[PDB]
């Protein structure tokens, strides 16, 4: 009952006891182990499989007289020749690996203890590729990379993490035992601004200004990310808005920014934004990731950036306006031309898979587990296959005999205005509208449809078993539409089997419809106008890159004569980095402008 | 001053948005066809329905009269809901709102 | 008997008790498992909440129909965890097997009626 | 619409039969208190804004 005892000693906090166990530990150590002098002392300390030794229990619990028990416990460590795989232990565990003293000092927010074990010496760069430390999901464990300098980052803890960075010994070059850099941990456990006063964008600022050079930002992870648009694939704004304008305006770490103010001759200030993974040009970028993740709620402030808007106004005119006037007019050329063939049975045949080619590769390989929105992108898409798979099965039927040939170009018929709406949205003039047409669509009337024909389906087809009359098949369907209208005639009742119901049923038929069918439309209107009548607009930009997203991909390599180049050579060091004119005009409040590269105000 | 806007802002709005609709359901009923058979009779049936008049459907010719009647059933709820959205709608904007600049403008 | 006869505040403090000193700690209902930093996982006593046991408070609370107060008396800590989850164990394989089993009956009736 | 979303559930318990045990929350968690056996069941909640230190916990090793 020894390596118990000395569990138990330190669990309650011992503030003499433990000492005396050492003194009895030490006397033991006179015994010949014969097989190890240290060692057999490092096994009677150490738990054996759960490797807690005398550090972890020490530290896993929290007692007044902390300070002493290690002092305590470093003093006969070092009187002992034992300081440096004995404070190095690791978890021997299948779901805990790597874990060292310095990772849970730091975590239960003990200052004085972590500047006590890296002053003797600590596993700063002790890495915990633990199951629990490196979870597949939310409610499994605390992913921070698995770096005790990440730790106190993500911990909100200011403190520690610049002591360590004075010590010379990190490893911020070593990413982490997953992929993902200090700073890739770093903004991922970042969230919105009602759980957090945006400490971490604080802390995003202190660690880079200790980097001093750009290798942070160019490292990926497994997956093959950087730190720019990891913030924009899950959706971060706050520490997105700080890296991209980023306005170091002090010298020896200028080149670590994003945002350089070109000239400033009095109130016009011209800034220039870097778009080294911002712009379509690379592989991966921002841009293509945030128009296409459908995983991000908060892209109503997400996409008005500084250098995304500008990159987004001014493209419209640049490559929407010579695309979206030409699918427009392409469209509606189609579809008059449509329409006089279809009236005339007693251009279109060229362009009718020239849909079924576009959306059948685009639905097929999209894939993005959308529709969250309802409204989204994809209903117009599925819309316009249906239109094209109808027409070229309207071709197939020609020469496949049978009938209903008008049935499916009729069908197609009032599917190709349907697809005419979308093409109204684009307009800076009905775009703050039409997204609201959509939605009454989708969410009000779709919602009125369904419990109408469930109603009158039912009661349609009760009095046709029941039955110069309305008998059956579309007769009954037919004499309740003209009751909801305003039209047909009551009664008559050739058949006398019980008419008393008969009335009856048609009574609360007309009843229900006008009163409680009714309810629920006018109802809505009360709540949608009031409250989202005021994010029309909002929504209406989400779709507003769809367009130009795909345009540029079924743009070929012919480039460079309508976006941005920028390339403003000498910006910093010795390269080139693209930039983006803004000619930004403060006009209030002067106070002189001396933050500048470039001495002329040039162009 | 404010009849002017509504004519152009709120009507001309309402106009092309119920055009697009009545001329592309007439003609997908004309084509389909004592009866309404093409010309005016297709907008001029449509447009019976939406202001209280006319007789539904009769069908002379057998292609698929379950369509016909879906089509008719989708086109009168469409406008009196939707189409109808967009015109009250506009009211309660402007009235709260512009019905202050009549005079300035 | 707090959730028989409709009171609030004596049974939340009595399912969140969150004793922390010691000599005593049995004598509670919430314990915290493990706090790894912002991430604390609390554990419930449930000994007379689901209904394993023979009279529950989740079977009494449901079907008295004498409480008017049951908007936040079902709301509590170890009740909507034991509610939201158990809808996809239980109601996610029985809701939908009533509803389709009674929508096939609603057709296979009307087309016997109609025909 | 709380109110009748537990009527359901109840009643589907009701009528399913005693095999169970695969579906709901066993949650033993041995030696919790004392030396018996009482059934717990899980939350994990993040606070995020107070931290402030935690030292109220009767497991050191954070598990599963």
Not at 52 to 58: E, N, S
Not at 104 to 120: F, K, Y
Not at 344 to 350: A, D, H, S
Not at 388 to 402: C, E
């Amino acid at each position: 009952r020894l390596k118990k005892r000395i569990f138990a000693a330190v669990s309650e906090g011992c503030v003499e006891e433990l000492v005396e166990l050492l003194v009895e530990l030490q006397e033991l150590c006179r015994r010949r182990h014969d097989e190890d002098v240290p060692d057999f002392l490092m096994h009677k300390l150490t738990a054996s499989d759960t490797g807690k030794t005398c550090l972890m229990k020490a530290l896993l619990n929290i007692n007044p007289n902390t300070k002493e028990i290690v002092r305590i416990l470093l003093a006969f460590a070092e009187e002992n020749d034992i300081l440096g795989r004995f404070i190095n232990a690791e978890y021997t565990e299948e779901a805990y690996e790597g874990q060292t003293a310095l990772n849970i000092a730091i975590e239960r927010r003990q200052g004085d203890i972590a500047a006590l074990l890296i002053a003797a010496g600590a596993d700063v760069n002790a890495h915990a590729k633990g199951a629990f430390f490196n979870p597949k999901y939310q409610h499994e464990g605390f992913y921070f990379g698995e770096t005790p300098l990440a730790l106190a980052a993500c911990t909100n803890q200011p403190e520690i993490v610049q002591l360590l960075m004075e010590h010379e010994q990190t490893d911020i070059t070593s990413r982490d035992s997953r992929g993902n850099n200090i700073l890739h941990a770093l903004v991922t456990v970042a969230e919105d601004f009602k759980t957090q006063n945006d400490f971490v964008k604080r802390m995003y600022d202190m660690i880079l200004l200790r980097s001093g050079n750009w290798e942070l930002e160019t490292t990926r992870n497994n997956d093959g990310l950087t730190p720019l648009q990891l913030a924009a694939k899950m959706g971060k704004a706050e520490i997105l808005k700080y890296i991209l304008s980023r306005e170091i305006k002090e010298k020896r770490l200028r080149s670590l920014s994003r945002k350089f103010t070109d000239w400033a001759y009095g109130p016009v200030s011209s800034s220039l934004y870097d778009l080294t993974n911002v712009d379509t040009t690379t592989d991966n970028s921002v841009l293509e990731i945030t128009v296409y993740n459908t995983n991000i709620d908060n892209r109503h402030e997400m996409l008005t950036l500084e250098p995304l808007h500008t990159l987004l106004h001014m493209k419209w005119k640049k490559f929407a306006k010579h695309m979206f006037f030409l699918s427009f007019c392409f469209y509606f050329f189609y579809n008059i031309t449509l329409t006089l063939v279809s009236y005339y049975r007693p251009f279109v045949l060229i362009w009718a898979m020239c849909i079924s080619v576009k959306e059948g590769i685009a639905i097929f390989l999209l894939r993005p587990s959308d529709l969250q929105s309802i409204l989204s992108d994809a209903w117009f898409h599925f819309v316009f296959f249906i239109q094209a798979v109808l027409v070229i099965l309207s071709v197939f039927l020609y020469l496949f005999a049978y009938k209903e040939y008008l049935a499916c170009l009729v069908l197609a018929m009032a599917l190709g205005w349907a697809n005419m709406l979308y093409y109204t949205r684009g307009f800076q003039s009905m775009g703050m509208y039409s997204v609201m047409i959509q939605k009454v669509i989708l969410h009000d009337v779709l919602k009125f449809l369904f419990v109408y024909i469930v109603f009158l389906l039912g009661f349609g087809v009760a009095l046709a078993s029941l039955i110069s009359s309305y008998g059956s098949f579309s007769d009954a369907v037919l004499e309740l539409f003209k009751l909801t209208i305003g039209l047909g005639d009551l009664n008559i009742q050739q058949n006398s089997k019980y008419p008393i119901l008969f009335l009856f049923l048609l009574i609360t038929y007309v009843i229900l419809t006008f009163v409680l069918l009714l309810n629920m439309l006018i109802a809505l209107m009360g709540e949608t106008v009031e409250n989202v009548s005021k994010e029309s607009e909002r929504i209406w930009r989400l779709q507003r890159a769809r367009t130009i997203l795909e345009f540029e991909k079924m743009l070929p390599e012919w480039l460079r004569s309508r976006f941005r180049m920028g390339e403003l050579c000498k910006v910093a060091e010795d390269d080139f980095r693209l930039c983006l004119r803004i000619n930004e005009v403060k006009w209030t409040e002067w106070k002189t402008h001396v933050s500048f590269l470039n001495e002329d105000p040039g162009p």
